[PDB]
Amino acid sequence: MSKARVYADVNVLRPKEYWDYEALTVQWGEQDDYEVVRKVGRGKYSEVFEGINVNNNEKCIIKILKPVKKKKIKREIKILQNLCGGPNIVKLLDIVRDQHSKTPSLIFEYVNNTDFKVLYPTLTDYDIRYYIYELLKALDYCHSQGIMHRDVKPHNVMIDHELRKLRLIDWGLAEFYHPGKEYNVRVASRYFKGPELLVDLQDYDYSLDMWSLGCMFAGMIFRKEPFFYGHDNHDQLVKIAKVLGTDGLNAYLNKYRIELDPQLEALVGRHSRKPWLKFMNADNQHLVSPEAIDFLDKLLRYDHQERLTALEAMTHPYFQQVRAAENS
Numbered sequence: 001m002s003k004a005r006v007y008a009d010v011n012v013l014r015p016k017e018y019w020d021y022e023a024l025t026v027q028w029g030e031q032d033d034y035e036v037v038r039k040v041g042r043g044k045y046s047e048v049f050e051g052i053n054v055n056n057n058e059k060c061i062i063k064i065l066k067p068v069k070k071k072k073i074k075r076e077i078k079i080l081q082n083l084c085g086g087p088n089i090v091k092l093l094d095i096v097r098d099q100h101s102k103t104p105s106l107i108f109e110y111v112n113n114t115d116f117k118v119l120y121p122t123l124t125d126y127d128i129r130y131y132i133y134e135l136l137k138a139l140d141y142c143h144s145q146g147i148m149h150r151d152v153k154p155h156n157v158m159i160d161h162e163l164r165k166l167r168l169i170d171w172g173l174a175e176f177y178h179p180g181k182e183y184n185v186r187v188a189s190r191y192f193k194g195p196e197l198l199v200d201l202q203d204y205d206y207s208l209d210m211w212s213l214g215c216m217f218a219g220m221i222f223r224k225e226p227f228f229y230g231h232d233n234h235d236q237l238v239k240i241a242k243v244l245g246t247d248g249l250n251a252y253l254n255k256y257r258i259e260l261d262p263q264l265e266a267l268v269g270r271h272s273r274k275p276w277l278k279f280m281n282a283d284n285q286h287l288v289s290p291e292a293i294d295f296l297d298k299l300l301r302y303d304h305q306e307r308l309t310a311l312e313a314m315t316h317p318y319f320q321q322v323r324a325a326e327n328s
């Protein structure tokens, strides 16, 4: 049986109303207050437009939900309400609906985000350290609130490079952490799914997000997005193993008394561990310093229990200049 090494009893001492998201009662605003300016994004669960709050004439983000079960939508909302004002946590402005179809839309703060596919490549060594650091404040904060974002990826990290402002967005897949509960493992995006998810280990925790963060951090310094480029869940676990080696995996499996499956276990095969430096070339050599490697290595661990916690990561020597900067 596995659990969390930190923040494990947050939802405990906390009244049921904090996590009993199904007892939530949505207080709907007026749909008109917000007008769609232009489309900017879309997911398999919604469409996203830059909008304008007709009263204050200020920009906003309108997330029009697609047929979602009501329980699911109360989860994304309750969690959002619970994290309001948290370091770098995207702010939920309003909840509205279309009277006829009952189509709901969540109004969020607006961020003039620069696509990561284009942004990331120009970031400097320090920018990387800086923004990862900011993303870490968001994770440590939600983890400390009893919430797993379970879907960390560039697409969900909005960055206004001009203002050097960052926000962790889209808490649809997020979930409340309960000591001992099992969770669906069809979360996160293949390229960021932790090994636990690829081996059916159901009782995971905040740790899952640190693996994803690690994948994100890896792609950034090694300039290889995604880092673990697989074609499907099976290929995902394999692509990982060809890097961390199968022994760590075998040890991982055996420690939690888990057992892969024929085609899977046979698919993975046997692989030696490939050192992190084997991924250094001339397009990233100026970003793969020892502190970077040491920090990455402490995030990308098979065993979710070994991985650094959000709080510890922010103190790793890798971020010392960012921290020293902050103390001014």
Ligand SMILES: CC(=O)Nc1cccc(Nc2nc(Nc3ccccc3)n3ncc(C#N)c3n2)c1
Pocket (backbone or CB within 6 Å): 040, 041, 042, 043, 048, 050, 061, 063, 090, 108, 109, 110, 111, 112, 113, 114, 115, 158, 169, 170, 171, 172
């Ligand atoms: C909204 C959500 O949960 N997920 C979701 C799903 C797909 C795309 C997006 N997109 C998306 N895009 C932006 N900003 C933006 C993007 C490109 C150019 C200019 C501005 N923002 N800004 C805040 C939020 C926020 N919050 C957001 N979401 C969001």
